[PDB]
From a paper:
Milano is a contractile tail bacteriophage that infects the pathogenic plant bacterium Agrobacterium tumefaciens, an important tool that is widely used in genetic manipulations of plants. The contractile tail of Agrobacterium tumefaciens bacteriophage Milano is flexible and bent to varying degrees, which sets it apart from other contractile tail-like systems. A contractile sheath and rigid tube assembly is a widespread apparatus used by bacteriophages, tailocins, and the bacterial type VI secretion system to penetrate cell membranes. In this mechanism, contraction of an external sheath powers the motion of an inner tube through the membrane.
To explore the fate of sheath disulfide bonds upon contraction, we solved the atomic structure of the contracted sheath. The structures of the sheath subunit in the contracted and extended states are similar and can be superimposed with an RMSD of 0.7 Å between 347 pruned Cα atoms out of a total of 491 Cα atoms with an RMSD of 3.9 Å. The larger all-atom RMSD arises from the different relative orientations of the linker arms invading the neighboring subunits’ SHD. The rearrangement of sheath subunits upon contraction resembles that found in other CISs (roughly, each subunit rotates and moves radially), and the integrity of the two-dimensional mesh created by the sheath linker arms is preserved. Upon full contraction, the Milano sheath subunit rotates by ~12° and moves by ~13 Å radially. Two of the three disulfide bonds that crosslink sheath subunits to each other are retained in the contracted sheath (Cys14SHD–Cys244SBD and Cys216SBD–Cys327SBD) whereas the Cys47SBD–Cys182SED bond is broken. This suggests that the disulfide bond Cys47SBD–Cys182SED needs to be released to allow for the rotation and radial movement of sheath subunits during contraction. We could induce contraction by a mixture of guanidine hydrochloride (3M) and dithiothreitol (DTT, 5 mM), a reducing agent. In the contracted (post-attachment) state, the tails were straight.
Residue numbers in the entry:
A (entry chain D): 281 to 501
B (entry chain D): 2 to 501
C (entry chain D): 2 to 56
D (entry chain D): 169 to 224
E (entry chain D): 57 to 224
F (entry chain D): 281 to 392
Write the structure that this text describes.
Amino acid sequence: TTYPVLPYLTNAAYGALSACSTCNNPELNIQGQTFGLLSCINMPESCTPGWTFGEVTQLQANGFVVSGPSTTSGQGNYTSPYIYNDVTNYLRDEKNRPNATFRDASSRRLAAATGVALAEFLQQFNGLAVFTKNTNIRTGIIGTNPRLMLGKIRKWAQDNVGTLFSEFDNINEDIQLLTDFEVQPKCVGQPGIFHLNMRYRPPVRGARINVNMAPALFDNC
Amino acid sequence: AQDALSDGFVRLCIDPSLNFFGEGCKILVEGQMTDDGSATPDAVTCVTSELDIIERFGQGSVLTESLRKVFCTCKSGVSVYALPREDAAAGVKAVYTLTIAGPATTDGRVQLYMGEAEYAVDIGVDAGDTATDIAAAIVAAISPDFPYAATAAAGVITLTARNAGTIGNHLSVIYTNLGSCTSVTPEGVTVTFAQTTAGSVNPTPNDYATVVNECCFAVYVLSSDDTDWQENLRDWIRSAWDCSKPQCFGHGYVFNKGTLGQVLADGDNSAELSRLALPTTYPVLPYLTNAAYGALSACSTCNNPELNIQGQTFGLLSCINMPESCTPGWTFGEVTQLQANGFVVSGPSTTSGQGNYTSPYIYNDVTNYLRDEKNRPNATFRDASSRRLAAATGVALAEFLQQFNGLAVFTKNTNIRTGIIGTNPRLMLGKIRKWAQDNVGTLFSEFDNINEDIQLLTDFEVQPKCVGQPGIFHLNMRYRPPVRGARINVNMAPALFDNC
Amino acid sequence: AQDALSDGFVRLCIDPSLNFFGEGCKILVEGQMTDDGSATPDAVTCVTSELDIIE
Amino acid sequence: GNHLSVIYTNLGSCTSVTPEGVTVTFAQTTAGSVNPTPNDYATVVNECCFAVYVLS
Amino acid sequence: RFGQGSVLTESLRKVFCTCKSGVSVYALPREDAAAGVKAVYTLTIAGPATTDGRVQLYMGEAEYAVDIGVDAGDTATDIAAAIVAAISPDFPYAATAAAGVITLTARNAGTIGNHLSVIYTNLGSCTSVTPEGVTVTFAQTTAGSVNPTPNDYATVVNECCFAVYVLS
Amino acid sequence: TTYPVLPYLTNAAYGALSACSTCNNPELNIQGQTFGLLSCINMPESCTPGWTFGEVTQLQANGFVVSGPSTTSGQGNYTSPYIYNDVTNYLRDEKNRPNATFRDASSRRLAA
C-alpha cells in the first residue's frame, strides 16, 4: 500500500525486462539484483521494507511476484527495485491438484519457445510424402517414413539438451511417434496423421538456496 | 554540437556509475540527548562529522560525548549513525557536590580529573584565596562538554548531570594533584566529592523494530547502564540474527559497571552483546569507554572482520585516558572470573605511581556467549571476531550465491550450451567449492576435506517423493573460521648445565 | 535485511552445533568438608577451578 | 490515478537542509472512479501474437 | 488458527520443528469441555534478594525457559513481575503476578493442564549464581477437570486416511 | 511422574518423527539416538533417570515406548529425549496367545 513509485511504471519495467529477455534467453528468470533489476525505476530508500518478510513469504507462496529495494539505508538515496521471484500466478492444476508446471514465468516463456521450436522443426516434414516405416525412400524423392521422422525428432531433441531441455532420462521412451492407425480403431484412423508425445525436462527457475553454515572450531574432535 | 560529435557518427555517454562512495562504518550510537539539541528523538540519523554533534544532540549530553569518542576513535568516519533518546519523564538528574574548604595559605595548582582526561581542570590557586574563589575558578575551568552543569555556591560546586537517569551516577572526580612532586597542591585547600543525589528512572524505548526496521548496523553502541535497555537492544540484535527472516547481522556493545558479583549477575548468554566489565572504582565515564570500544570494533569491521579488538596494539582505546594507579581496578582473580563468564575486561596500558594518564586497552575481545541452546557450553560465538566474521562469511557466501539467481537450472547431467544463461547443481557446487577454496586464509582456515565439507543437494533428494519443489537447493558448509587467540602459556626453562 | 539476503533467494542458518565442549575428566573426589564451606553436603557438585575450593 | 505518493524527501536531511517554516502536506481530496473495460482483445489483437502484454 | 499458547498450537509447533519442511500436517482442533477446569499453579517467590544473581527457570520445555537478572534489594514483587514479563507468550499457561506469587493458569481446561513442571534450574550452579534471598516454590493450587470426549472420528475423519494420529 | 517436559510435546515430536519416516522409509524404527532422537524437545539433565531400569524393562515388556535422555550429567545442560523402543502397545493375539506380528510400530507402518 505504501509503494512510492507509480505502480504501472514498475509493472512496465518488469514486463519490458521480461520481453527483452525473451528476445534473447527464454530460460532466463527475471529475478535478483542482476537479471531482475528494474534499473530505470528509482524509489527512495527506507528502513520500513514495504512488505514484511512474513508478507513476502505469504505472497511468494500464493504465486505473486514480489519486488524489493536493491539497497536498504537511512541515508535517503534512491534505490532500484529488483524482482524477488519471477513466477506466474499459477498454483494449481485443473483438478486444483497443486502443480508446478507453469509456476515460473520462465516456464511459460520456455514452453512457448519449446513449442515454437518443435513446430518449426516439424514443419520440415510438411509437404514430404509419407511412406510406411519399412520403405527405404530412394534418393531424389521428397519423402519420409515415421521411422525417419522419429529419428530426426529424437536427434533434434538431443540437440537441444542444455539449450532448451535438461538431459533425457530415456530419450527412446520419452519421445514417441505413432501413426493415426495405431491410435484410432480399425479402419477409423486417417492416413498422414501422427501423434508425437514428448516428455521433456525443462530448466527450472531456482527459488531458494538454504545455506547452513556450521563453523568448526575444534581440532581434536 | 561539437565537431566529431555533430554528425552523430560517434554518440557519446559519460556514465558516472563507478564513482559512487560506499557507506563506510555503520555504527549506531544510542544514548540520551539534552533538550538543547535539535535532533528528533527516537529516530536514527546520519552524523556526518564532529561539527554538528553539539548542535544536533545537545551540548554536553551523553550521546554528544559518546559520539565525540566514536569520532575520535575511527579514522575519518562519516557513516556514524546516532539514535538520540529523550530523558524519562520522571527522570532525576544525579547531583554531586565537590565541596572545597580553605582558605589557601600557600600558592599551588589544583588539578582535577573529572570524567575523562578531556574534561580535566588545572587552576592556579594563590595564597589567601577563599574557598569561594577556588570554587569559582574550578567552575570557570570546567569544560562545557563535560556532561555535568557546574554551579558554585559558597565554595560548594554542585555538578548536576545533563541527562536524567542512572546514566549520571558514574562520575568520578579525582583530585589528581595530592602528593605530586612536580605540581604542588596548595596548602589549605581540601577537595571533597559526595554525590548528594542519585539518578533515577531511565528511558526504556523498546522501539528498535520500528526505528531500525531493516536498516542494518554492524555495531550498536549503547550509552546506558540500564540492564532493561541493554536487554531490549539484546533482543533486537538477536532478532537481527534470526533464521526466521533474512538476517542482516549486528553486534551490540554495552557496559556493566559494578562489583564482581553485580557485573556477573548482569550477564547472560547473549552472543549479541559484548559486555564490558567495569569496576566500581572506574574513573572514566563508562559510556565513553564503551563508545570507544564499539567504535574501534566498527572501524575494524570496515577493514578486517577477522581482527580481534584486543591488546595494546589492536584494542587500545587511545582516545580514553584515565589516571594511572597501582590499584588495578579488577584484581586478577576478578579478571579471570569475568573473562570466564564471557565479559570483556579492559585494563590500563601502563601501571605507575607517577600519576600520568593511561589509555585502557581490551584484554579479551569476546561476546557474552558461553553456552548453546542446550546450555551445552559451546565456543561458536565466544569471540566478537566470531560474530563479525560469521556475518562477513554469510554475506560473502550470499553475494556469491546471488550469481546463480536468474540462471535457469538444468539437471546435473545437462551440458549447458554456450549463450544459454543456465547452470546445473554440479556446476553450482563446483563454483561454490572454488569460492570457498578462494577464501582460505582470508575468511576460513584450510579445509579438512572440501569435498565432504561443502555439500549441495536439490530439494528432490531432501524431501519425500514428489514433495520437493524444483529449483530449491540445500547447501551445507562445514568451514573452519579463524579463532581469536586467547592466551599463550609460555613456560621458560633456563638450562645452566653443560654436562647434563 | 541485508543485500543478497533480502530477496530470500539465499536463506542462511549458522548452526553452532559442532563447537560444544566435551565434559573432560570425570573424577569424583569425596571427602569431609569443614563448616566454613558453602557447599551443600551430600551432593555431587562440579568444581570449575582451584579458585572456589576454599570458599 | 489513485496511486500517487509524494514524499518530502528532505526532512531531517543532513546535507540538504530543508527551510524552517515550510510544511508540506499531501491529502488526495478526491478519488479515481470508473475505469475502461475494453474487452475487445479478440478483435484488436486477433492473431497478432505478443510475447509480453503489459497492463498499466 | 488454533489459539495463542493452546495445546494444539504447541504440539503443532513441535510437529513442524521435527519434520523437514512438511506442509501436509493436518490438525483436528477440539473445544474445551463445557465444565472444564483450568489447572492453576502458584510459583510463589519470597525475598527480598540481598545479592545480585540470575534466576533461571525451566517451565514446560526449554523453549519456554526464563532467565532474569535479579539485583540486590529486589523485593519478591519485582522478581515475580520480572519472571512474568519474561514468560514466553507461547507457554500454555497465562501468568499473572500478585504480590510475589505468580499464578500460572492453564490456557486449556481439562486434565491436560495438570502436567506442568517448573524447575528452578539455577540452584547450586557454579556458572550462573542464583541470588541470595530469593526462594522459588511451585505448588499447583488447583487441578484440571472434565476433558473433551469427542468420539466423532467416523464423521470428522470419514475416509480421509492418516498415516499418523497424534493425540495431545 | 517426574517428567519435566509437557507430555504432549514429547508425544507430538515422537509422532512427527514417525510420520516423517513413513513418508520416506516405512521399515525404519524410530529408535535410538540417531533415528529416534526428539531433537526439538530439550529437558534438563539429571542423575535421577526418570524410570529406573527395572521400570524400563517392565514397561518395554508390556508394550510401552520408553524414552530417555540422550546424555546423563550433573552439569545441568539440556538433553533431547530419544526413544528406547519403537513398539506398539500390542502384546497378544485374539486368542491372547502372546504374539509378535504387530509388536513394532515398524510392523504396523510396514504392513500398511
